[PDB]
């Protein structure tokens, strides 16, 4: 019941800023007891969790954590991990865009000249290698290692497991950025057209075309928590999109100049964006407040990536530089480069690497291992980053050790429970709710009778009229705002009685001004008009 890690398992609910029905009160006590019992027996599983995340801790003060070479790491770790830290070297086809699968099993490299390859990177099994002689840009897997989508010279192509072409997308005119929403089965695409396109991969149907209306799209990342896509344009504007709304759900002014790279935490809370104004920014995403602004980098951060344990890798040409606990709200977590005189409130880099001769293309963490695979101008290189991988995976979401029968069955299972595209909101706790209109107090038809009664008495009681008040500075008197917002040709009875009540309000303001200034006494209310009433 005490459970030091319950706040990770808590679920937030509706607060309005208690009942008398006994049966409903019992139902609500049962609901609250069941919720607390399920949270406690859910959070009591960290005893059962098998592995533990890695670390590298300096054990000294002369040992800085970032001056540790990969040679020292590969000596100090075991042979399975130092054999996983691969190094492909493929010099003639161009800068290699690297993508992994969603589990750590497969790798998909995409040379800029023509060279695409889907492989098992920890076996030695390559299962597609194809030299599409035109300049390919990016590639992703779709829902398995079985299908992969490549963004070629203009058209996006979809190839199967052994490389045969399955589809040539006539839309997706010039993709440069591909992505996949795997619960929703949507291939997302942006590029040199200013359009964002979602292609439902199961049925085969373009779910949405969205005008970004900001020229070519410079960076694009997926928020894994709610599957909204963050794009990054040439204004230094990040924009959060959903396939339901033909506009961005949010528009953030992140940087000056363009935006080079976007990366999102897997808890959907933080976003690191680097722009070409040599600046990195860390954003809260659930509140859209800017946490950190690391400005004046030595050279513009061309790539950002965020692991499953909140590490933050930045690439600025040849350099790769990782910070640990830079996704926090304290200012003493802002990622710096040097602790001026050993200041322990400064976030010096976790580690670093200099890909000396070349310039890195893009980073991607291997999903469930302690590796950061970065693709560069001559091939691929995994980097053993010890603090940067979810060690305790869930095996009935996605499984590194899966078999062919488990792959077949999990494929049909997720295909069956494919979420629709319209359930992509800014938060996924919104699709059991009631409307944000349609009032909270449930109307038990006595109030519906009362609503018809006030609607039947809106005339001759003036319920749909602003009430008379002379003491509200009559240049903004509400009734004059009614008469001014209405169109000045038409006459209707509502504006007739608003006109009458405005003149009445002006008369009461006239007599209050007169008996404030003292030209007249208390009421003396027009003796002969009193007598001539009844006529």
């Amino acid at each position: 019941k005490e459970r030091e890690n319950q706040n990770k398992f808590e679920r937030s609910t509706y607060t309005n800023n208690q009942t008398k029905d006994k049966k409903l009160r019992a139902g609500l006590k049962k609901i609250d007891e069941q919720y607390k019992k399920a949270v406690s027996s859910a959070a009591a599983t960290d005893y059962l969790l098998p592995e533990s995340n890695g670390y590298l801790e300096p054990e000294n003060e002369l040992e800085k954590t970032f001056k540790v070479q990969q040679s020292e790491i590969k000596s100090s770790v075991d042979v399975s991990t130092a054999n996983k830290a691969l190094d492909l070297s493929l010099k003639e086809f161009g800068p290699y865009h690297i993508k992994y699968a969603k589990n750590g099993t497969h790798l998909l490299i995409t040379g800029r000249k023509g060279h695409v390859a889907s492989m098992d990177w920890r076996k030695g099994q390559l299962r597609a290698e194809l030299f599409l002689n035109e300049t390919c840009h990016s590639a992703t897997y779709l829902q398995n290692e079985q299908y992969f989508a490549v963004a070629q010279k203009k058209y996006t192509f979809i190839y199967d497991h052994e490389g045969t072409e399955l589809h040539r997308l006539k839309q997706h005119i010039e993709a440069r950025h591909l992505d996949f929403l795997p619960y929703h089965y949507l291939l997302v695409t942006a590029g040199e057209t200013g359009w964002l396109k979602y292609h439902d991969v199961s049925t085969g149907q373009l779910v949405s075309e969205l005008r970004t209306k900001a020229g070519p799209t410079m960076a694009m990342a997926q928020n894994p928590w709610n599957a909204v896509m963050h794009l990054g344009h040439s204004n230094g504007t990040v924009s959060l999109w959903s396939p339901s709304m033909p506009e961005p759900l949010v528009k953030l002014l992140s940087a000056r100049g363009p935006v080079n790279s976007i990366a999102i935490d897997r808890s959907g809370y933080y976003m690191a964006t680097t722009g070409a104004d040599r600046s990195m920014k860390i954003w809260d995403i659930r509140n859209f407040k800017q946490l950190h602004s690391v400005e004046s980098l030595p050279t513009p951060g061309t790539n950002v990536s965020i692991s499953d344990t909140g590490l933050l890798a930045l690439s600025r040409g040849p350099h790769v530089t990782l910070w640990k606990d830079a996704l926090k709200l304290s200012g003493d977590s802002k990622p710096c480069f040097g602790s001026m005189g050993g200041n322990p409130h400064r976030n010096t880099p976790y580690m670093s690497h200099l890909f000396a001769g070349n310039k890195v293309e893009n980073l991607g963490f291997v999903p469930f291992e302690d590796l950061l695979g970065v693709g560069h101008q001559t091939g691929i290189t995994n980097l053993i980053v010890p603090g940067a991988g979810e060690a305790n995976y869930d095996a009935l979401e996605l499984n590194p050790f899966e078999t062919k029968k488990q792959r077949q069955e999990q494929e049909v299972r997720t295909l069956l429970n494919k979420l629709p595209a319209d359930t992509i909101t800014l938060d996924p706790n919104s699709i059991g709710s009631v409307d944000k209109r349609s009032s909270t107090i449930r109307l038990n038809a006595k109030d519906l009778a009362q609503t018809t009664m006030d609607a039947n008495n809106k005339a001759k009681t003036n319920s749909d009229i602003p009430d008379v008040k002379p003491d509200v500075k009559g240049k903004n008197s509400g009734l004059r705002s009614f008469l001014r917002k209405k169109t000045q040709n038409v006459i209707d009875e509502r504006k007739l009685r608003v006109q009458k009540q405005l003149d009445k309000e002006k008369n009461i303001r006239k007599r209050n001004h007169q008996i404030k200034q003292g030209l007249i006494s208390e009421d003396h209310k027009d003796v002969i008009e009193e007598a001539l009433s009844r006529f």
Binding site: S41, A44, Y47, L48, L49, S52
Partner: protein, 374 residues
């Protein structure tokens, strides 16, 4: 699955085991990962009784480490909370699962029963009675379960009526094994010896004889004979009279060698009338089983019956007051043998001579015994 269910049935004891701070969290994780290995191997496919046994051995070792570490950390024998009974409850339940999954393994059944008896004051004899009940329903043929069951309820609990019920039900199931019969006679003479020695003790402070054992001897011989003749020449009795008579003598040899074993294991009950309770067996041997014990074959066993009868009161020490008082009895028996048989008279005289020369100042009486046997 269900490995997840059992694996999270195991967490409140280690909530307790970290609260009472003897095991830290970092080693609760270690015993829990080994528990994960074992639980998956148990209730997946491809399982074995050795996986059950290795789980029980690991749970005993972590229990003993928990007791040792509770003594060493807290200087207290037991923390009188959940942590001390729950792992014994776990070991009992692993045993229960393994016995309900593989109920062909008497080794695992016996390890269950030995653990549940030797659990101590924590256990219940109704929790022993239920697992003896289901083991005995599963294996009605394996007689050593009934033997151990009655011996548990007598030589621990001493409930004589219920051990009588156990032996009567087991003899309803297999009236063919002589081991069950001989252990029933053993129980009953154990019972009457405890009965008459408590009679002697209560007499010293301040009806029921071996007749029950004689009746179970009677029905023991009758049923064992019926089952052996119905057993051999198995499928049918399609035979001639030569096979009938030869098989009837064959059952007689089997039955009477076993009643010899009854006597040689009957004699050691020296607090009651061993003479009378061997005299009833000698009297039952004296009658005929339609195979003519003294009129015909089993004539060497007729000599063995006469020899047992002659030594029945001559079961004596070297102190030969009784032998001097009743040597004329053996002399009259040897005279009756010399008056009737021809080669058996010679064999009985020679065997009585070697009997005196084996079971024989006092050497002058030994010359008198040699000149009495000469």
């Amino acid at each position: 699955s269900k490995t997840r269910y059992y694996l999270e049935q195991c967490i409140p004891e280690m909530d307790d085991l970290v609260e009472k701070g003897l095991f830290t969290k970092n080693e609760v994780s270690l015993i829990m990962k080994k528990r994960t290995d074992f639980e998956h191997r148990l209730n997946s496919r491809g399982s074995s009784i050795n996986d059950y046994i290795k789980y029980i051995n690991y749970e005993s070792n972590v229990n003993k480490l928990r007791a040792k570490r509770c003594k060493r950390i807290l200087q207290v024998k037991k923390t009188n909370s959940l942590s001390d009974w729950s792992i014994q409850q776990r070991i009992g339940f692993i045993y229960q699962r393994g016995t309900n999954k593989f109920p062909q393994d008497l080794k695992f059944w016996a390890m269950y029963l030995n653990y549940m008896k030797a659990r101590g004051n924590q256990t219940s004899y109704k929790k022993i009675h239920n697992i003896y009940n289901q083991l005995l329903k599963l294996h009605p043929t394996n007689v050593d379960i009934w033997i151990s069951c009655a011996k548990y309820e007598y030589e621990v609990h001493a409930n004589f009526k219920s051990c009588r019920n156990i032996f009567q039900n087991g003899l309803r199931f297999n009236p063919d094994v002589p081991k069950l019969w001989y252990e029933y006679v053993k129980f009953e003479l154990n019972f009457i010896t405890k009965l008459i020695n408590r009679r002697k003790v209560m007499g010293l402070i301040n009806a029921l004889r071996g007749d029950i054992a004689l009746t179970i001897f009677d029905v023991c011989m009758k049923t064992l004979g019926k089952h052996y003749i119905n057993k051999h020449k198995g499928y049918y009795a399609i035979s001639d009279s030569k096979m009938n008579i030869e098989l009837n003598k064959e059952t007689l040899n089997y039955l009477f060698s076993e009643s010899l074993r009854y006597i040689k294991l009957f004699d050691e009950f020296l607090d009651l009338e061993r003479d009378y309770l061997i005299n009833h067996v000698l009297q039952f041997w004296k009658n005929d089983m339609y195979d003519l014990s003294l009129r015909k074959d089993l004539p060497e066993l007729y000599l063995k019956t006469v020899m047992i009868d002659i030594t029945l009161n001559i079961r004596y020490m070297p102190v030969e007051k009784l032998d001097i008082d009743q040597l004329q009895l053996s002399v009259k028996k040897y005279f009756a043998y010399i008056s009737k048989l021809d080669s058996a008279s010679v064999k009985s005289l020679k065997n009585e001579y070697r009997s005196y020369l084996q079971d024989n100042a006092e050497d002058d009486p030994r010359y008198k015994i040699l000149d009495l046997i000469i």
